[PDB]
Amino acid sequence: QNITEEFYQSTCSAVSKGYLSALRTGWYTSVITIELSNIKENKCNGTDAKVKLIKQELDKYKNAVTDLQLLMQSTPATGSGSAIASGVAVCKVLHLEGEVNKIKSALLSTNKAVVSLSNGVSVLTSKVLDLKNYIDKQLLPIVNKQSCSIPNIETVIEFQQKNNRLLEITREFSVNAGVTTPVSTYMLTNSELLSLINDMPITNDQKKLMSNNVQIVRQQSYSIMCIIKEEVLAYVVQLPLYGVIDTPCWKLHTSPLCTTNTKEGSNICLTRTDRGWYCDNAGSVSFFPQAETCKVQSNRVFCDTMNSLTLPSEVNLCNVDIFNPKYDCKIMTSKTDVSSSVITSLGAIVSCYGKTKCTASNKNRGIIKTFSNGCDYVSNKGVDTVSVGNTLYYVNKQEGKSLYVKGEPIINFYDPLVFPSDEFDASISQVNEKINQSLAFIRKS
Amino acid sequence: QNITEEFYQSTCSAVSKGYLSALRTGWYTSVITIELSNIKENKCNGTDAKVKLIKQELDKYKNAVTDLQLLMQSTPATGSGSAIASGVAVCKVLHLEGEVNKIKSALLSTNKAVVSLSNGVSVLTSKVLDLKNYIDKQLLPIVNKQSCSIPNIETVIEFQQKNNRLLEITREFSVNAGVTTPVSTYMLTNSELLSLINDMPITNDQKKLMSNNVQIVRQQSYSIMCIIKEEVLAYVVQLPLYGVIDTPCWKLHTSPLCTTNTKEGSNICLTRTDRGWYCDNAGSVSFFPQAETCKVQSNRVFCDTMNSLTLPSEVNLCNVDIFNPKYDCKIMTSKTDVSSSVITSLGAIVSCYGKTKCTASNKNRGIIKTFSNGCDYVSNKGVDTVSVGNTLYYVNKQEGKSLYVKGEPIINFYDPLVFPSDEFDASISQVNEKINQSLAFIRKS
Amino acid sequence: QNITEEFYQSTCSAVSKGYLSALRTGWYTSVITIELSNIKENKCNGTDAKVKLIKQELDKYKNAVTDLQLLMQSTPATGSGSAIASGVAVCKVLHLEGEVNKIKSALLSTNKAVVSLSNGVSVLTSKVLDLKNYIDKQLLPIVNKQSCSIPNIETVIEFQQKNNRLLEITREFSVNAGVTTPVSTYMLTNSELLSLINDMPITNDQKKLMSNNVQIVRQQSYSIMCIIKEEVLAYVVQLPLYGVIDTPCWKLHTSPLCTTNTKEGSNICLTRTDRGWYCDNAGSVSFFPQAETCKVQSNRVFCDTMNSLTLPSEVNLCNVDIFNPKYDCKIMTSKTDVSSSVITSLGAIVSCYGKTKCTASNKNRGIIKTFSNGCDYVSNKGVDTVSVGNTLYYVNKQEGKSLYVKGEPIINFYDPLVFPSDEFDASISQVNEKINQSLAFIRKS
């Protein structure tokens, strides 16, 4: 993928192109089980040190089960849910009588198995840990008899190793009220996640995609605690399904565009709004305003559509013609000419105002460019850093072509006296109509 | 508790009723101690593998103590403190001479004990781990002699198990500058927290409440590191006291209300402000503007009053009469008619504008409702999902009654030419006075 | 350091003085290595319990290596990087052929060593864990032979202890896409961090500073995963270099200043903007608008300059003369007279409006001050708490002098009819010019 960039001197904005989409549009839920031991505490005459270690680890197992039980009695809402409703619907099905016996039968001989639930959902079930088998075969002869049998030291160590994952899962579920994201390796090991991806009803390009970006998949997944019932600990892992793939995506960067008069109070400023990630999606554009909602790997963006707005494709025209009537290009205005910089994908936008010392340097040559007052841009070819005031920014060293699109700063087309200089969410045409109204108040007088 | 909802078509807003309050109004501090060993490193001729394992674990114990000591030399401020000032006042009392000896005497024979501090605060002290007893009885004969004694392998394992909680507490305290929240099971086990709740000077309904919502209690508690002095590691657990209980609470949901003309630039929009949680409190209303400050379990809201504003009870009138003079109903205005949806407790508000494809579907029947341009609502009875543009929302499947309160959208009562369309925090009456002023500028001409 | 405070009754704002700066201006990168074993899985006839435990722990080691390898195949971007570009440049140098052999040679005999990389960067390299030596000397005779040798139980325990740090580092790197901050003790132990600080090319006051604030240093550091190649696991720890030291720093606190008429809709409000931390820096002022970007220890502020704005030193005049022409003092206006309080360093600002019950109490005397409608302040001498509505705030008990600078509230100098009451980012002079324009629209009529 070739990354390119375009700086628009007229609007103090830049667009980083060449990115490929992967938008989450669906969920794939899967049930993860832990076979438990319904054993109850047993006391026999015991004093030998190995028996003490076993009984100690057994109490940590019993507390882990009772803690998961009181966690499951009352499960907290997470702000209208919605991003978890798929998995929550599976946990509600699991509470039906006979449903845990169904998964208990399918995972009787193998670790993984597909199960058709009683609501038409074909889930992939897995049994990642078997504590009932270990406790009932290796532990019960030690406490369940009348006088305690003496266990070998390998058993004490093996039981602390096996019981550890149960304790860590209970720890994560306790501090997070039953809903964890990202999904840890305790909830699902990388081996188990990759095997679950491979066993999913998705295309081979989607398996290659999710398997090559497992850390992003983990960060966009949920682990929801279901139920403890009949020697079964069940919880749902909700994995992202990327319904939108390889569509063009671009990132808009904006910076304040002010006039540069020498008398403070005589300068006006404007800034394009709606900076962030845009991706082509189903004849429209999916816009992601929040900064943390899109993870980038290589030239691929991984977004969740739940945090997006759907805009007409004409919103891209704000990048080629901001004065263009097919879409009302939104701006904000002010008189706050404070210097700043924005590090883009292939360079840096610099808004320099007042007495601020703005420059672009190379590590061994020193200052190679001094910015004047206004908004400007520099590519990363030959530039390592950008300094604005007392702050030093590092330029991204990604290879790509930048294009400096020269043009008159549009802030110069505005008469300062009638400019609306404190708008917080104004359109280009909205500002023009407010100027037409301020010109009518002066026209009559 | 019966959950009900009311959608106001006139203002594009909904109120989810029937919730019960639990507001934090106080703090209950309690001291958690770990009895340490003032042992110093001892070297004897040692080479046997068991001695090596013991000395290794002993170095991890010594580093944990010195790390807690350098953490305690300089303890960082957490933004004016205040939400921790109770516990901080107890740590400052603990630094007095003789105060650690007081708790050291009360916890000499039992694990838990009430201690009257020298500042009038009756704290509950607990001794959750005893490393001085284990190290001095089981470890000192191994290194403190002239030539090392050989320990049995059970001791090596028992010491790694006992020392683990100390190491994990030091780990959490190191990355968080001595203040952790939520309070982990390492800081306080569920058994110890429930026993501390049971032993608190509170009513039985408050013990049942905190014991049935321990994960919410943990998320609203603080663990503050106090002092390492005289073989004692002390830290304060600050637990919430809910002074407001079972008062009605409701959640306000708002969405943009625009006009639906076919020419862009001719539409005006308004949105009610102050969406969030409201709870009746002491003759006024406690409002919670931040989204993460209230955890909901069942029909109970658990808020911290520190993040609230106190409003007159007349603020509820913005839900029945927004044009009502007892309270100045606040709105924001704009021309940004971008489609969106809000998932409520019992349905979904949909603001559909432009060419956006808005619909409500059932999983097996398909599209059951198509929204027209404007603001509308659909209940969760028979609806599973709501799609707006390229985004699919899941409706909460909670049982309850919705009431669709029909009414003329108030945005239609405004002449567009004189509407103030870029207000960021305007009142209903503020907009009307600004319209009266814009009508005076046209009246004279 | 003497902490002082000044409340300006005229502007409802306070300044907390006497703080010393420590601003991050540079990065010191250092390479942290783990010597790995390129062993491959070996199967021999094995059934004895000790052999099983060893092979189990060996599989956890092999998965940890393959997981770090698939994490290193595709490393995610973190929003234009920049705050990590130093360490990222070192990881890119490390990918060159012969560079891992260079650090492999320098750390052949000692744990720490300075290495001149092939790009002119003199990094400090460290070898914190040696798994190749342990696996190849103690483990290979157990599986690599034809039939398995029987290991002693001390080896099983020693290998679980040594392998643990590798597994935890892989766990943190897996959930965080290769970039962790703060830097945990697994990434770098306190002993290793202090030794790295001591071995840094910095002054002795900077070593005393970083060593006395290691938790703040950890919170302002990054751990970046580099490469797995040729029996070497390498990752860069990027530590802050504080180029600005002991410069005066002050914290500005602001609260709404409204008029107190008895008829709602007739009151106007103003609030000073740009509250936060200000520090003198190189002839200008470095301002930190975000609340979480500055950690305070003692009277020292630790900020990262990346999150700062550079302002002229005349910005301090907004604290002594807000109507002063050398700097255009910024404000926001509204009609939202909701009561609130701000806990400062030495007292509390209280904005009381409407019917709100505002008071300041002592724990044993009760209410010692009742605030009237308007903006006021109380020092912490004799005051423990401040109650506003249903909310109780704790006053910081830090010792210092407060100065109440009496003055007429500037909101009283404004005629309400022509006040711009919905400005979101207005200057004092901007509001005056907008008033001059509203006076011209009434002057003609």
Ligand SMILES: *[C@@H]1O[C@H](CO)[C@@H](O)[C@H](O)[C@H]1NC(C)=O
């Ligand atoms: C403002 O005036 C210009 C000039 O006649 C006109 O073209 C424009 O449509 C008017 N209104 C707006 C909203 O720009």
Ligand SMILES: *[C@@H]1O[C@H](CO)[C@@H](O)[C@H](O)[C@H]1NC(C)=O
């Ligand atoms: C605006 O005009 C109406 C009509 O006379 C009046 O009732 C109202 O009080 C005026 N002022 C405001 C602030 O609404």
Ligand SMILES: *[C@@H]1O[C@H](CO)[C@@H](O)[C@H](O)[C@H]1NC(C)=O
């Ligand atoms: C507003 O009017 C006053 C009075 O003449 C004048 O001093 C001031 O410069 C004018 N303009 C502004 C922007 O304050």
